[PDB]
């Protein structure tokens, strides 16, 4: 990431003395927050799975993670959300009776 000093090429740009400014408290907007982790776990206990989450668990158990990811991409917006939802569903499956 150190500049090469010339106006073309991979790390193009002027060589300057870097500083590494202090980290903003933003960029931590989606942080861990034990409080919210506890609350989310408790709410997941109180309210169970959505119908599509139950269907995704059934698909993971029977027809495979690829089919589950396809159905999750159809249900949710995008492929990344589908992957995250399938990972959460199979974590739920693991944390269920088949520990």
Partner RNA sequence: UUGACCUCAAAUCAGGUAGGAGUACCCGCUGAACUUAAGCAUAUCAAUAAGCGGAGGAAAAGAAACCAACCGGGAUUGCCUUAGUAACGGCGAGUGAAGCGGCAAAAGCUCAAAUUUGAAAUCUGGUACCUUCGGUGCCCGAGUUGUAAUUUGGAGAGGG
Partner RNA sequence: GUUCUUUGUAAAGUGCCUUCGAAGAGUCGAGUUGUUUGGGAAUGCAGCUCUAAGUGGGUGGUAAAUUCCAUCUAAAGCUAA
Nearest approach, Cβ of 39 to other proteins (angstroms)? 5
2 forms part of the interface with other proteins (CB under 8 A) = no
Give the DSSP letter of residue 5: S
Secondary structure of 44-85 in HEC code, one letter for each residue: HHHCCCCHHHHHHHHHHHHCCHHHHHHHHHHHCCCHHHHHHH
Shorter beta-carbon distance to other proteins: residue 16 or 62: 16
Shorter beta-carbon distance to other proteins: residue 64 or 84: 84
95 forms part of the interface with other proteins (CB under 8 A) = no
The site map against other proteins for 34-63 (x = CB under 8 A) is -xx--xx-xx-xxxxxxxx-----------
Burial of 45-79, coded b for 16+ CB within 10 Å and e otherwise, reads eeeeeeeebebbbebbeeeebeebbbbbbebeeee
81 forms part of the interface with other proteins (CB under 8 A) = no
Q: Note the residues at the interface with other proteins (CB under 8 A).
A: 3-10, 12-22, 35-36, 39-40, 42-43, 45-52
């Amino acid at each position: 990431t150190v500049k090469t000093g010339i106006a073309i090429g991979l790390n193009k740009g002027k060589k300057v003395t870097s500083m590494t400014p202090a980290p903003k408290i933003s960029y931590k907007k989606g942080a861990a927050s034990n409080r919210t982790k506890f609350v989310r776990s408790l709410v997941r206990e109180i309210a169970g799975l959505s119908p599509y989450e139950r269907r995704l668990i059934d698909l993971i158990r029977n027809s495979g993670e690829k089919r589950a990811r396809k159905v999750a991409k159809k249900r949710l917006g995008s492929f990344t959300r589908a992957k995250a939802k399938v990972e959460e569903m199979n974590n739920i499956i693991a944390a269920s009776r088949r520990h």
